[PDB]
Amino acid sequence: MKLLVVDDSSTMRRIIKNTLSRLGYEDVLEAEHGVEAWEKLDANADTKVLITDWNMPEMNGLDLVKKVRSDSRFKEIPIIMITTEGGKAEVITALKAGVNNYIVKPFTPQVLKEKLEVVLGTN
């Protein structure tokens, strides 16, 4: 279960990675921006799950998601967007792009554990 986690906040990456670890997911690769995330997916097509934010320089998460879904290798990759964009207009926008599960920031460590366990369970 190779996961890639993309967020331009170092503290957010910390919390997500720790939470995944608590759930038994240890094979976690990170990226700070969309460009870097895309390079990593393209070069590590064995990646099983993409977890991404939305707002970030160097390609935003919506564009990343569209690009992933347009690639023949990643038609079925689960995509989890974790973002402060809580408005339903944004939710709809992201689901249409190919996001499968949408988790709205901010959360406590425990709430993130609960919401990720819903999607991924334990490993």
Could you list the residues known to form a binding site, using ranges.
7-8, 53, 55
List the interface residues with Mg ion, window 64-103 (CB under 5 A): none
**Helix (H) or strand (E) segment spanning residue 49:** strand 49-52
Cα-based distances in Å from 91 to 10, 46, 117: 24, 27, 20
Find the helix packing angle between 34-43 and 61-69, rounded to 10°: 20
Choose, by CB under 5 A, the member of 40, 69, 105, 113 that binds Mg ion. 105
Choose, by CB under 5 A, the member of 86, 87, 106, 109 that binds Mg ion. 106
| Token code pair at residue 55 | 């707002």
The nearest distance, CB 33 to Mg ion, in angstroms, is 9
Partners of 6 in the beta sheet?
31, 52
Q: By C-beta, is 56 or 94 nearer to Mg ion?
A: 56
The nearest distance, CB 107 to Mg ion, in angstroms, is 7
List the interface residues with Mg ion, window 34-53 (CB under 5 A): 53
Q: 22 near 65, Cβ under 8 Å?
A: no
Q: By C-beta, is 24 or 86 nearer to Mg ion?
A: 86
